[PDB]
Structures are given as structure tokens and as C-alpha cells.
Design a protein around this ligand. Structure first.
Ligand SMILES: [Cl-]
Length: 500
């Protein structure tokens, strides 16, 4: 009475972590539908079927009566096999059974922002599920079915074309590192009364994003009553002024200029500096002469500004642009922001000073981590990747190996020297990094670093949004998170200790 071609759903590819742990799995679910044309000939069966579907008798009957002309309506999607057989056993004419695919996410909220989710039609709508949708979805088949003049699926003819299953995808993320970072960022938020946060971990040798976690987060397996703020992958889609965490790059421009060495001295007394109506102000103001390492340890805005006036903002802009701040990462992640590294024909003094200590530009947590990776990797930037990297692509030298080496040594002193950020110290290793405290009377606390300082393997960025306890400095709020997560990450990757 009617020959028709209908789609065959393809099996969606498995997403694993870098070691094969499942992160997104296509699982069979039982969906029930009905042909109202057939139901209309068995009305005396409707109340038992309605009750079986948890439905009010009258509302069910109103539904079928309204659709009496159509030949298809869903009844309920995604049931257990025991549930569907429970209904089919009633043998109600025109009630049919189907098996579909539905994603399950074994790690739930721990990796929701990176993995994303699919819709009820099994299409990728967010995160990796969307970015890699063509790779994961495969290609539907087609089959030929005969249907009588009332919609009854009389015969089932051949398969015209088989479905092509999707392909497996292994991410760069290490699920063991991801759990640790997730736990500790969460603990830090709760201990500090903070509103939001991000943590990014990167392999400085391969470009791999080993961990990417945010708060708040959500359970992708139960998205009822989902708050869209809980769904933001802040590490990639939120932009912020990085503040003093960019001082290592200002310093890289200074050491490359020919005009400065770490033992050179800047006079920062009295801890402020007027630029017209604008006033640069240090956080501690009992200093006069400081050497370049001292400027980083004390995080003196006056110090880095006087250095910036000497070498010119253009050279600072250039290093920041070369390491990727405010530049397109090329990951193609949905909603991923680029930020902004402003430019000028001639840089005014005030813009020059603020650029040098990280105001006036916008970056993401992932760009900041990638810039620190380039610095840890002896000045060579390796392309970012969200998937496991087997053949490493060639990187670009963006800071000279000698300059990067020197800046690494200074940042090890930031963490280890007297008056330094002692809370970022990693037991059994040497660590290097810089704190940040940036306006947003509310602040973001930041720490960016890498370890082991002797032979760097891992770069990490911690951002904690609006800590509400008395201490809000990056060195008080974010540095201890770096310490706990870096220690766990190095242990898990069996990195040999360089400080025992
Ligand atoms: Cl943008």
C-alpha cells in the first residue's frame, strides 16, 4: 500500500580520556510510540495504556483523539528494557517499541564543561560533543518498510544502506588529574566563600590540555532545572584582566631588549608614581632600590612600570602577542573567546604602565596557561590540543631560550625566596610561578606557574572569582590550590622529584 525509506540511526562514537576511561557512552534506551489510526480502533484499551504511562485517563484520550489523523506520535522516550516490555505485553494495537541511543556521562559534573552534551536526538550541542560532532556522529543508514493504508508496518523489506558508526575520540584530558583539580578548586571555593573559579593544566611539551575544570558546574546526566551560569566553560569563554600574572612577560621583553639584567636595580620609592591624573600604587610601600627579581617577588607595579617606560610598550605588546594572549587559540571550542590585547600607534605612558602589570587587556584562563607553557618549554610554544597527541607537531620559538631560562629562574625565586609566595611551594619539587590580584571592590585571585623548575613538565593556572574572606590576594587564595594540584599531577605522571 506504501513503500517508504526510513533512517537507521548510527551508533555515536565513544569519548574517552587520554588513557581510555569512558567519558561519554552511547547506551541503548527503549522508546515507545503509537499510530493513532490504529489506537482509534481499540479505545477500550486506552485507560489501561494511559495508567501504564503514568497518564491521566482523560488527558491521554484527549491526546489520541486530537491526533486521530496523524500516523505517528511519541509516547515516551528513553525507558528501561523491562519498562518497555511491560507496556508491549498489554498488546494494545498500534503501540510500538523502538530502541534508540542516549548518551551517558560516567564522570558527570567532573568533566561536563569540556565534554558537553547531546540533545534527545543524539546530536552534539555543547563542548566536545558539538565541536567534534561530524567525527562522533557517523552516518545514518536507510531501510525499506511496507506500510498498509492505515500506517501498520506490514512487512520489513531489505536494508538499502547500512549505518556507519561514529569514531572513538580520546581527549587530552587525564581523568585522574581532572578529578583532583575538580576536588581542590571546589574545596578552595568553599573555604574562601568564592563565587566561581577555573583551573587549567597543560603539558608544556605536547600542548595537551590535561585538565580543565570550572565552578559552578552541573550534572549532564540530569539536566532538569539547569542554571545556564552553571554550564559556562569559564576557562574558555570568560575573559578577564590578568593583572600581575603577566609581569614575567614584561620581564621577558626587558631582558631581550639588551638594556636589563636581573641584578639591575630600579628605585621604587615612595611606592607610588604619578602619571598625570593617574597614580600607580604598589601593594607594599617600604622599598627603595629593588633588583628585577625583587620587583617580581614584591610584585611592585612602580618597578615594572619604570622598566616599561625604559624599553617601550611595543616590546611588551610583542611578547604578549607572541605567547598568545588575546589571540585566537584555534581550538574552535563553542563560545570560546579571544579576549583583547589592545594596540596603539604611540603608547601613552599610562597605558604603557598598566599593560606591564596586566590591566588594559583581556585573556582567558586557557590563553594564560598556554603562555606559561611556552615560557616553561624554554620559550617554545606548542599548539594547543583537546585530543590525545601521539605525534607532536612542531612548536614556534616565541621567547629566546636564554631569556625564557632566566625568567624561569626568577619565577622559582618568586616561590622559594624569603618574602615569596611560599604557599605555592610543592613538596619534593622546585616550582616557579607568579601570583595575581585583579579588579573585576571585588577581585579575582590568580596564580600561574609550572614545575619542576629544573626541567618543566606541567603548567597550571588557578583563577578564583570573588573570595569573600579577609584575604583575597592571589598568593593567599590561589597559590595553595596550585600547590596541592601540582603535587598530585606530578605524582600521577611519575615525574621525578628535583627537590629531595
Ligand atoms: Cl572575544
Amino acid at each position: 500500500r506504501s513503500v517508504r525509506h526510513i533512517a537507521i540511526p548510527a551508533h555515536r562514537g565513544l569519548i574517552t580520556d587520554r588513557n581510555g576511561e569512558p567519558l561519554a557512552v552511547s547506551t541503548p534506551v527503549t522508546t515507545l510510540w503509537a499510530n493513532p489510526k490504529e489506537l482509534m480502533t481499540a479505545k477500550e484499551r486506552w485507560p489501561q495504556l494511559a495508567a501504564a504511562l503514568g497518564q491521566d485517563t482523560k488527558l491521554f484520550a484527549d491526546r489520541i483523539e486530537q491526533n486521530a489523523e496523524r500516523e505517528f506520535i511519541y509516547l515516551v522516550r528513553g525507558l528501561t528494557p523491562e519498562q518497555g516490555e511491560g507496556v508491549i505485553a498489554l498488546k494494545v494495537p498500534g503501540v510500538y517499541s523502538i530502541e534508540e541511543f542516549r548518551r551517558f556521562y560516567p564522570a558527570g559534573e567532573v568533566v561536563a564543561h569540556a565534554v558537553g552534551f547531546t540533545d534527545v536526538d543524539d546530536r552534539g550541542r555543547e563542548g566536545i560533543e558539538l565541536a567534534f560532532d561530524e567525527w562522533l556522529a557517523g552516518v545514518p543508514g536507510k531501510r525499506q518498510v511496507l506500510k498498509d493504508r492505515r500506517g501498520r508496518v506490514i512487512k520489513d523489506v531489505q536494508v538499502t544502506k547500512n549505518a556507519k558508526p561514529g569514531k572513538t575520540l580520546a581527549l587530552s584530558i587525564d581523568l585522574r588529574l581532572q578529578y583532583l583539580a575538580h576536588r581542590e578548586l571546589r574545596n578552595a571555593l568553599l573555604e574562601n566563600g568564592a563565587k566561581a573559579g577555573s583551573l587549567v593544566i597543560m603539558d608544556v611539551k605536547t600542548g595537551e590540555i590535561l585538565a580543565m575544570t570550572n565552578q559552578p558546574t552541573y550534572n549532564p546526566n540530569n539536566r532538569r532545572n539547569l542554571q545556564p551560569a552553571a554550564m559556562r566553560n569559564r576557562a574558555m569563554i570568560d575573559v578577564f584582566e590578568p593583572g600581575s600574572t603577566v609581569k614575567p612577560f614584561s620581564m621577558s621583553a626587558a631582558l631581550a631588549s639588551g638594556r636589563w639584567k636581573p641584578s639591575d636595580i630600579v628605585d621604587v620609592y615612595p611606592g607610588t608614581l604619578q602619571i598625570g591624573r593617574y597614580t600607580i600604587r604598589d601593594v607594599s610601600r617600604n622599598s627603595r632600590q629593588l633588583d628585577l627579581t625583587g620587583i617580581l617577588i614584591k610584585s611592585s607595579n612602580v618597578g615594572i612600570s619604570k622598566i616599561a617606560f625604559d624599553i617601550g610598550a611595543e616590546s611588551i605588546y610583542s611578547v604578549m602577542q607572541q605567547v598568545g594572549l588575546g589571540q585566537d587559540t584555534g581550538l574552535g571550542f563553542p563560545g570560546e573567546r579571544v579576549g583583547n590585547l589592545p594596540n596603539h600607534r604611540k603608547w601613552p605612558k599610562a597605558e604603557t604602565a598598566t599593560l606591564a602589570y596586566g590591566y588594559g587587556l583581556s585573556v582567558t584562563a586557557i590563553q594564560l596557561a598556554h603562555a606559561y607553557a611556552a615560557l616553561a618549554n624554554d620559550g617554545k610554544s606548542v599548539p594547543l590540543s583537546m585530543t590525545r597527541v601521539d605525534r607532536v607537531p612542531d612548536g614556534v620559538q616565541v621567547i629566546s631560550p636564554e631569556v625564557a631560562s632566566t625568567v624561569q629562574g626568577m619565577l622559582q625565586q618568586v616561590v622559594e625566596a624569603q618574602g615569596g609566595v611560599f604557599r605555592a611551594q610543592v613538596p619534593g619539587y622546585h616550582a616557579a610561578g607568579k601570583s595575581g590580584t585583579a579588579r573585576k571592590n571585588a577581585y579575582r585571585s590568580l596564580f600561574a606557574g609550572f614545575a619542576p623548575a629544573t626541567d618543566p613538565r606541567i603548567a597550571m593556572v588557578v583563577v578564583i572569582d570573588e573570595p569573600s574572606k579577609a584575604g583575597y590576594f592571589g598568593g593567599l587564595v590561589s597559590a595553595p590550590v596550585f600547590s596541592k594540584v601540582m603535587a598530585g599531577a606530578l605524582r600521577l605522571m611519575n615525574v621525578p622529584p628535583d627537590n629531595l
